[PDB]
Design a binder for this molecule. Sequence first.
Ligand code: Y8L
Length: 296
Amino acid sequence: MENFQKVEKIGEGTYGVVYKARNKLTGEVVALKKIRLDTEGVPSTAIREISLLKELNHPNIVKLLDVIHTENKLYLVFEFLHQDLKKFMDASALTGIPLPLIKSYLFQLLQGLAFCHSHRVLHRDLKPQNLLINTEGAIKLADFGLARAFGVPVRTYTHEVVTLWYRAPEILLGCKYYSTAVDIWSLGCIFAEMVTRRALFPGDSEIDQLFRIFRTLGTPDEVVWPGVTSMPDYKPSFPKWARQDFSKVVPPLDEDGRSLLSQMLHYDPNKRISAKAALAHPFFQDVTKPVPHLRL
Ligand SMILES: Cc1c(-c2ccnc(/N=C3\C=CC(N4CCNCC4)=CC3)n2)sc(=O)n1C
């Protein structure tokens, strides 16, 4: 809109392009998301779906400040946070993020997710790029509720590929009515990634993604994942790999963290820990809120 001066492109929200922008009236600087319209103006369904998001406010959810549906168009105006977790991970790769700060971030996000999930909202696409951090030690969920309202192309507008690395295996095997558990999976993968400084399952197509998972956790079967063999894209011809021990997967994480993670990465989404229950895990008995060394 004319109310906003674009200061810089900071991202893509797979549907939309996101800009740092300055409110010409209120001086506030904001993240401005302009949603790519199916051109099929804006489905009215989608509008009332985004409306609900304006009320889903939490210290660990990036605050949706306004939705602007005017003339053709749909813009989302969020509070601006000064970087994503991906850049901090990148910046931290040589020394590794301190464990107490890993823990604070995991904790905080579990609080975000516990809140969302308690309102039957799923993120569905958690990744380091959709997690935003500030200088005070907050970490916040972003870029969600978008994906319910419209369906997103994989090549998107910007021609960059969609990241699969954080996809739960039920989604990959073709389930439609998957659950809050998908986000716990994605968060486990990020958790591992913060701890190791390497992505856990950096697949580059759906089957590579799924076989990377199989390789580390074992090919799923009916013993560990009752029902798995009736899922839409499950093939009896999947290679049958044996499970790694987690001690190989995320050294040198301590037994509590490792145990937490293995429950976040349970194949069966029903045996996968919830966000609420994860908060009560012994790993957070010594949880603190440290200050990050940022590079703004
Ligand atoms: C980036 C973003 C949103 C957003 C919301 C609030 N703050 C921010 N802040 C930044 C997000 C990204 C960013 N980058 C800095 C350099 N390139 C990597 C990403 C700098 C700032 N983004 S909302 C959404 O859908 N997306 C994709």
